[PDB]
Amino acid sequence: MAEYKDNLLGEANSFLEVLEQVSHLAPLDKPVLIIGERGTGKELIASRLHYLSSRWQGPFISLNCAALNENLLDSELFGHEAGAFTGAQKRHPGRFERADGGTLFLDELATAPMMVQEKLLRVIEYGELERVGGSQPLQVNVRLVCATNADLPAMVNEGTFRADLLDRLAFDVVQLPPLRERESDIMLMAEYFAIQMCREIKLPLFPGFTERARETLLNYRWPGNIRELKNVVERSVYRHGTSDYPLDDIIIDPFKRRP
Amino acid sequence: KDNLLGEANSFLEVLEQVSHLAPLDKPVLIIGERGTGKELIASRLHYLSSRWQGPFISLNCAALNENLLDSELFGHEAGAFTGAQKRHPGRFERADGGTLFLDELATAPMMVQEKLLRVIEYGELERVGGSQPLQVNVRLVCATNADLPAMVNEGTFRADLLDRLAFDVVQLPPLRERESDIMLMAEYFAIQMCREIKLPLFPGFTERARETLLNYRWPGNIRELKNVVERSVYRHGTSDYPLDDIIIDPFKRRP
Amino acid sequence: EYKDNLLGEANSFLEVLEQVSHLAPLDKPVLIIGERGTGKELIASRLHYLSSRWQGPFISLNCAALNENLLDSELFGHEAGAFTGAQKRHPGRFERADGGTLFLDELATAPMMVQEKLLRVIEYGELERVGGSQPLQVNVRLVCATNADLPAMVNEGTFRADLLDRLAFDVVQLPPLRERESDIMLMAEYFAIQMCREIKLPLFPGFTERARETLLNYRWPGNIRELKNVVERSVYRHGTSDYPLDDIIIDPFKRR
Amino acid sequence: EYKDNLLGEANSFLEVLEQVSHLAPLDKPVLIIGERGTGKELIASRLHYLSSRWQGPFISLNCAALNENLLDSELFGHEAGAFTGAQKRHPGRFERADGGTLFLDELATAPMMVQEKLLRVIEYGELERVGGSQPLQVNVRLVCATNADLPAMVNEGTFRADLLDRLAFDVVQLPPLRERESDIMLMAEYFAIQMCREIKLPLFPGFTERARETLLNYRWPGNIRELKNVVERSVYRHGTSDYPLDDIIIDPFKRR
Amino acid sequence: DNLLGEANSFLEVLEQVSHLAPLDKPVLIIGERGTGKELIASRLHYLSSRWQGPFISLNCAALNENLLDSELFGHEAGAFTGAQKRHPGRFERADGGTLFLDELATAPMMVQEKLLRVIEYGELERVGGSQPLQVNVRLVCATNADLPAMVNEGTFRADLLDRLAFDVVQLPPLRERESDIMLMAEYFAIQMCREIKLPLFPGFTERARETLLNYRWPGNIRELKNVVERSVYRHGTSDYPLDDIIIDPFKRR
Amino acid sequence: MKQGLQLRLQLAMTPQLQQAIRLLQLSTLELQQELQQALESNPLLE
Numbered sequence A: 001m002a003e004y005k006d007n008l009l010g011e012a013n014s015f016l017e018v019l020e021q022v023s024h025l026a027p028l029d030k031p032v033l034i035i036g037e038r039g040t041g042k043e044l045i046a047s048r049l050h051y052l053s054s055r056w057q058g059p060f061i062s063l064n065c066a067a068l069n070e071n072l073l074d075s076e077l078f079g080h081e082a083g084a085f086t087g088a089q090k091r092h093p094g095r096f097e098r099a100d101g102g103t104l105f106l107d108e109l110a111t112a113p114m115m116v117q118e119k120l121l122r123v124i125e126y127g128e129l130e131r132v133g134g135s136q137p138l139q140v141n142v143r144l145v146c147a148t149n150a151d152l153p154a155m156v157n158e159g160t161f162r163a164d165l166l167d168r169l170a171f172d173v174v175q176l177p178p179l180r181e182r183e184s185d186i187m188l189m190a191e192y193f194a195i196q197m198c199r200e201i202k203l204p205l206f207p208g209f210t211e212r213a214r215e216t217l218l219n220y221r222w223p224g225n226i227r228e229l230k231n232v233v234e235r236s237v238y239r240h241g242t243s244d245y246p247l248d249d250i251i252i253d254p255f256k257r258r259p
Numbered sequence B: 001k002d003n004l005l006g007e008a009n010s011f012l013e014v015l016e017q018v019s020h021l022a023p024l025d026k027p028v029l030i031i032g033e034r035g036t037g038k039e040l041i042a043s044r045l046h047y048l049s050s051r052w053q054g055p056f057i058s059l060n061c062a063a064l065n066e067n068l069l070d071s072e073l074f075g076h077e078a079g080a081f082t083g084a085q086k087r088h089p090g091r092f093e094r095a096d097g098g099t100l101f102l103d104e105l106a107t108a109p110m111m112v113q114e115k116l117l118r119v120i121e122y123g124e125l126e127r128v129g130g131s132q133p134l135q136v137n138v139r140l141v142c143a144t145n146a147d148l149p150a151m152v153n154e155g156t157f158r159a160d161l162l163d164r165l166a167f168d169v170v171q172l173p174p175l176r177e178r179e180s181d182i183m184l185m186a187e188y189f190a191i192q193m194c195r196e197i198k199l200p201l202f203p204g205f206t207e208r209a210r211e212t213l214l215n216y217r218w219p220g221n222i223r224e225l226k227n228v229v230e231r232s233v234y235r236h237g238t239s240d241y242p243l244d245d246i247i248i249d250p251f252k253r254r255p
Numbered sequence C, D: 001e002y003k004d005n006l007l008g009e010a011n012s013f014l015e016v017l018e019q020v021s022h023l024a025p026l027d028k029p030v031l032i033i034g035e036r037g038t039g040k041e042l043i044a045s046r047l048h049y050l051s052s053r054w055q056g057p058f059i060s061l062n063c064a065a066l067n068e069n070l071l072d073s074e075l076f077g078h079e080a081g082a083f084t085g086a087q088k089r090h091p092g093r094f095e096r097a098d099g100g101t102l103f104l105d106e107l108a109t110a111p112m113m114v115q116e117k118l119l120r121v122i123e124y125g126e127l128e129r130v131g132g133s134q135p136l137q138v139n140v141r142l143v144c145a146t147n148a149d150l151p152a153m154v155n156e157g158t159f160r161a162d163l164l165d166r167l168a169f170d171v172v173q174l175p176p177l178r179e180r181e182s183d184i185m186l187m188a189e190y191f192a193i194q195m196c197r198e199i200k201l202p203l204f205p206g207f208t209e210r211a212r213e214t215l216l217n218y219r220w221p222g223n224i225r226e227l228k229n230v231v232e233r234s235v236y237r238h239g240t241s242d243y244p245l246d247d248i249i250i251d252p253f254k255r256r
Numbered sequence E: 001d002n003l004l005g006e007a008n009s010f011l012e013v014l015e016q017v018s019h020l021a022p023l024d025k026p027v028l029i030i031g032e033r034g035t036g037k038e039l040i041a042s043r044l045h046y047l048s049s050r051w052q053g054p055f056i057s058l059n060c061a062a063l064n065e066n067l068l069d070s071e072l073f074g075h076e077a078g079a080f081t082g083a084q085k086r087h088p089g090r091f092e093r094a095d096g097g098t099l100f101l102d103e104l105a106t107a108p109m110m111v112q113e114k115l116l117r118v119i120e121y122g123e124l125e126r127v128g129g130s131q132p133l134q135v136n137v138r139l140v141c142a143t144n145a146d147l148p149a150m151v152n153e154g155t156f157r158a159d160l161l162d163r164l165a166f167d168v169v170q171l172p173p174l175r176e177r178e179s180d181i182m183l184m185a186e187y188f189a190i191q192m193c194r195e196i197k198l199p200l201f202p203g204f205t206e207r208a209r210e211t212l213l214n215y216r217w218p219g220n221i222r223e224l225k226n227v228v229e230r231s232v233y234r235h236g237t238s239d240y241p242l243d244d245i246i247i248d249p250f251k252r253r
Numbered sequence F: 001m002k003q004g005l006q007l008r009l010q011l012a013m014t015p016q017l018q019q020a021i022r023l024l025q026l027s028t029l030e031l032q033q034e035l036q037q038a039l040e041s042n043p044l045l046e
């Protein structure tokens, strides 16, 4: 029950209202699934919910699906208490077991194991989990947290997600105001990042920027919603590296061949 | 033993059907377009049977992992690798007469079937190198949220797998079919949600919402009813005004 | 200082270097659009000896040869005795990262899963592949480098938006092999001298200007030490640098 | 004297010998354009006895008859307290040879991942020993030969073309069976003396112009192992040193 | 043994084979589906001064290469580390005589290499506690069926191929001799009859004999045996001379 | 490949060398005290 607003910045679009609805959700602990641009408000939203998780709620058990190799992903999945799986020793409790009450920080990675998918379905089954050789089921608890970045209904029509992947998933949806869409705190969060950037640069004075830069900023797509711009901003800071020295351009697409 | 019954002649019909199946312990599998409380179904069945005193505790079949089906069928091995030495017995034996819903059957694997079937059709507890097999006549039944006869057309399973169920697979009506007490059913879902939302009470929804409930495709049949119910609740969070709108396609993005 | 070796008289080599210098205190990612047999490694060195934490770790582990899918999980970690057959994670790379940066070669092949796992690293970086161990972060910076066509990857979708973005913070185009022609003559003689010395070849053959012209004709896209490789070839062509230099070897497959 | 195994009186063989003499002390990487059967494992141990360290030996055994795990898991060996399944500090045969020379074989069989690892070693030389540790280097020559056209294989895009150069100090061809023609008469005589000694056949009973023509027509698929093996089959056909050699078992595996 | 080498190319072939038998040169042989290679090898071994020599015939497929040499070598360990004495040793087991290799054609190259040149010195034949030493067993492998293109398929270790014997055991089909047919046939028949404890060889009608005379009989001696057996149970009685050339228990008929 | 632990690789212990190590870890003053208290019955042990 505190601020912990952190660098949650640039919500002058209805992403403010997005946050508001997020708040409306925040008390309830039921399954969380969202949607939006990767590396862009998204995991920041994750932090947002992690704050929405009571500070005393528990371990923000981060779930990063692009990992897990192939198999004993299963181990930490169902668990591993027996021998011959995870160095034996104690019942190794999986990251799934690691969360007891914690965040099911489900990441929408679109990796191949719908095998995994069914597993997590049983992960979201009755509040329960059972290890490798896991001689007994154990009725488990954890906060549940997913999000998205692509057309889940299409993949359903594409069959790509387990139908029940979504069926069990997403009590409701939560999207993001795209960089082609949000477009409101442009100069605002622009300056915020710039402040951080100069401060790290310890740049003696805020360069300032010409309006041609902001005109481009409106013109820019910013496909990566939050960071790509932010990276661009820091990049302007670098490619300039001058204090009080007003900008007139920005650095984003170094793939643009030099002149 | 008790759940959000579908309160319906098709539902009460499947009820009497399972009731005909009640003390019966012969093998089985489930029919059903989706699941419609697939777990809850087998679960109430479990709560009923002579395995009521028996272990009415399931196991998720096609969960399992590659190399260890031996143990999976038969619990932890004494002689598998050096570490363990105790012939910990079948998850089946962990019931061995209780009620252990063979769920996840559709997603199961090929040689995995090759063993589990043959054993179930015939095989006492022949574990890793053991002395003497013991038949754990464990209350037998599986399930199919999918179409096995289709799988037969595919031929993925054993025709023995076809033999597996000793019972005819009851099915529940599609949501498009069932759609029976969804008024009262949703009302209960809402009483639930308001309790979960700690909401004071429900004045109601639109009768337009009622018709949209009628005018509902309803794929996530047993889920989505109460699902989008409470979804409408929270996206509303409002009890003073009727749920004139309900949370239709969360997949849909509003304008 | 990278011995100041690999001299690029292309003042763009210098300009790159200046960008490097600006980047030197800087601590954020960077791509080096390298070349086939170019030598992004050596320049990355020249950077590291100049790193803001130049005293920091400087490891060269690329997953280009990631024959094992599990060589990854390792590189992401291992629980002590994870799986089994082992004692602890061989964490050397994870070691260099804390108190260091990240350097890789030819990031093209990465399992997309591996890649976005790296993604969950870069923004936050948990103790990973650790068999359920609690998270942990390596005070890790980064640097990137390849000869691949980034647009080709983008079409391939090879880098995710989160990936392509948060992965990338600077772009260092290695000049084309022939781009740095005056640099070519320069570092060419640099090698010529370096060879004549270390070979202890009693005399230095020098260089035939015709050989020089022929060498310049070598598009020689590979020149990393591929310059040095063809150089050793030519040295053997001379065999001994006592005589003045004319015997220049480029293509060694040829019998006779 | 290394017993002058395959004493090639051929001027091509003579020049091959002269050049092998030139560069075997050059304990450096080089390219053997060579194949099995044609000097199958013929020159390596000579150049090892000709290696800079005559005290230094020839481990080699880097034949690529191994497919997936064993090839590498013996290559680096592996770690002691960590592996797929063995607590063996397999130091790898790279550790094995101290002082002398070693060769990599069937190099075409290698994967690209192995290709980059090895070419790196050819550059890097330090290595963390598969499992991962403080890397360490050895100072010695590098040797390999492949029967294929790696210019095309890299044109086929299959291997460390970086290896295909850094090793490729000079692609060193050697004579095939089809290469040996006039000295083939002498080679027949020498293998015959060797066999008559070994087979306890009294001596060379004599050549048959008929057998001579039969062998001359024999296109000789294999080069050396074929020579000895067909000698064995034909001797078994004859089994005596009285009648002049005509029983030529050109196909010891001819049917019936 | 009843070779009945009535091909009589079988005869001179046996002449050369036993000629090699006293010699202990390595053995690599190609055998017909029904060649009775065992008998040939057995005859050579008894003909070898390893008449009494050890003759471990390695049906080389049942193992685990996860203990490949751990069989091929074995391990010596005793006392608190492990109960028993020590391993017999695969190279150690056949030591002093025939080293017969079977189940070789479709084998894992784990074995192929693990044996490859493994005896060229041989002094490295007992490890993991098993105590290394060199040995002398007449190396034998046989039943060769892989085409030379299998060596061109390379899966046949051409290293083993050069490591193979100086030539190959040529083998013809049962369609070839067609000679001791009635003979060894009756040999089998009476052999069964006694094994059947049967009354007596009722005989064979020439109709069966003719139907037989037309057969490639790939199963060679096995074909002979099996055909005899099928027709034998088919007669089910020994009253009159049988009449059926029992081809195959396949047709529903 | 698919890693883990797999079966591979008993008898009766005695405290013989164990009692010996008990002596060695014990100090040579009392260790000789036991050494005397040991060699007493061992008539062939001087």
Ligand SMILES: Nc1ncnc2c1ncn2[C@@H]1O[C@H](COP(=O)(O)OP(=O)(O)O)[C@@H](O)[C@H]1O
Residues within 6 Å of the ligand: A007, A008, A009, A010, A037, A038, A039, A040, A041, A042, A043, A044, A045, A189, A193, A226, A227, A228, A229, A230, A231, C123, C162, C166
């Ligand atoms: N207000 C902001 N200003 C500048 N950059 C931001 C801001 N918010 C987020 N970012 C950048 O967006 C990047 C990706 O964040 P995010 O989308 O949450 O990652 P994920 O893919 O894990 O969701 C981060 O690296 C961060 O630097």
Ligand SMILES: Nc1ncnc2c1ncn2[C@@H]1O[C@H](COP(=O)(O)OP(=O)(O)O)[C@@H](O)[C@H]1O
Residues within 6 Å of the ligand: A164, A167, B003, B004, B005, B006, B034, B035, B036, B037, B038, B039, B040, B041, B145, B222, B223
């Ligand atoms: N008859 C029923 N009574 C009460 N709840 C039910 C009933 N049928 C289904 N459910 C609900 O459905 C959920 C189970 O979903 P299920 O149909 O098993 O998913 P799937 O179709 O993917 O197997 C449970 O949470 C349960 O509350």
Ligand SMILES: Nc1ncnc2c1ncn2[C@@H]1O[C@H](COP(=O)(O)OP(=O)(O)O)[C@@H](O)[C@H]1O
Residues within 6 Å of the ligand: C005, C006, C007, C034, C036, C037, C038, C039, C040, C041, C042, C043, C105, C223, C224, C225, C226, D123, D162
């Ligand atoms: N500026 C330079 N100075 C010295 N050597 C270089 C330079 N650039 C490239 N090389 C040589 O190229 C060989 C491989 O170089 P390079 O291609 O940079 O590595 P990578 O293959 O990672 O790009 C290295 O061993 C190095 O000696």
Ligand SMILES: Nc1ncnc2c1ncn2[C@@H]1O[C@H](COP(=O)(O)OP(=O)(O)O)[C@@H](O)[C@H]1O
Residues within 6 Å of the ligand: E001, E002, E003, E004, E005, E031, E032, E033, E034, E035, E036, E037, E038, E143, E184, E220, E221, E222, E223, E225
């Ligand atoms: N001359 C023969 N005398 C007796 N039996 C024979 C004769 N030739 C073949 N057989 C029979 O044919 C079978 C051939 O077996 P085998 O040599 O193992 O075949 P393969 O070499 O294809 O494995 C033997 O079991 C044997 O009983």
Ligand SMILES: [Mg+2]
Residues within 6 Å of the ligand: A039, A042, A043, A107
């Ligand atoms: Mg994320």
Ligand SMILES: [Mg+2]
Residues within 6 Å of the ligand: A121, A164, B035, B145
């Ligand atoms: Mg389901």
Ligand SMILES: [Mg+2]
Residues within 6 Å of the ligand: C037, C105
């Ligand atoms: Mg490179």
